[PDB]
């Protein structure tokens, strides 16, 4: 008989995500424009996490800007922290704003994670 | 008392990785040059996975090319499949070439995964 194998490392994705977290200061391809604030950002990772941002880039393609005024800077920074780790931070005064932000950005699993703590 | 929480979704990294896997055809920032073959590639994800490629980009910064002639095209494609999934494919005729490639690219965990099947 002849044998071939497909071996899977389930910690790989978490590990790659931590190396990508290091690059949030060369690799930045775009700026998120929220309030009058600009956050340098890696395009493919935000497009990957948020279907909204994915669609926005198809329809809204010299620094490249992705506009977002319907979410505060503090909340988006906690969401970006989520995107690069899988962990979100939640207070009594915050969880509602985060759930609404998650809805805007079509972060469907973040939203489900937030509602389970209500 | 006042209470804040940090909630962690451990499937998040795998899920983001699958959305990034979709983009391997806009998001491509560079070409891998192996043999006389060019593979359009997302820069930050290869830099993140491979410390070698990370270093190469610091020292070797108009399409941007990352040169790599010490690995075959077939093997690198299986490695790129690993990078975007955590799964590697391994035959009797292949595992040695993959282990050597993993060493070149400083893919330390891929290498450990490959040696466990020897």
UniProtKB/Swiss-Prot annotation, chains A, B:
Changing residue 15 to S: In GAN1; no effect on binding to TBCB. Expressed in brain, heart and muscle. Changing residue 75 to F: In GAN1; no effect on binding to TBCB. Residues 28-92 form the BTB domain. Ubiquitinated by E3 ubiquitin ligase complex formed by CUL3 and RBX1 and probably targeted for proteasome-independent degradation. It comes from the Eukaryota. It is found in: Cytoplasm; Cytoplasm, Cytoskeleton. Changing residue 95 to T: Found in hereditary motor and sensory neuropathy; likely pathogenic. Probable cytoskeletal component that directly or indirectly plays an important role in neurofilament architecture. May act as a substrate-specific adapter of an E3 ubiquitin-protein ligase complex which mediates the ubiquitination and subsequent proteasomal degradation of target proteins. Controls degradation of TBCB. Controls degradation of MAP1B and MAP1S, and is critical for neuronal maintenance and survival. Interacts with TBCB. Interacts with CUL3. Part of a complex that contains CUL3, RBX1 and GAN. Interacts (via BTB domain) with UBA1. Interacts (via Kelch domains) with MAP1B (via C-terminus) and MAP1S (via C-terminus). It is linked to Giant axonal neuropathy 1, autosomal recessive: A severe autosomal recessive sensorimotor neuropathy affecting both the peripheral nerves and the central nervous system. Axonal loss and the presence of giant axonal swellings filled with neurofilaments on nerve biopsies are the hallmarks of this neurodegenerative disorder. This is Gigaxonin. The lineage of its organism: Eukaryota, Metazoa, Chordata, Craniata, Vertebrata.
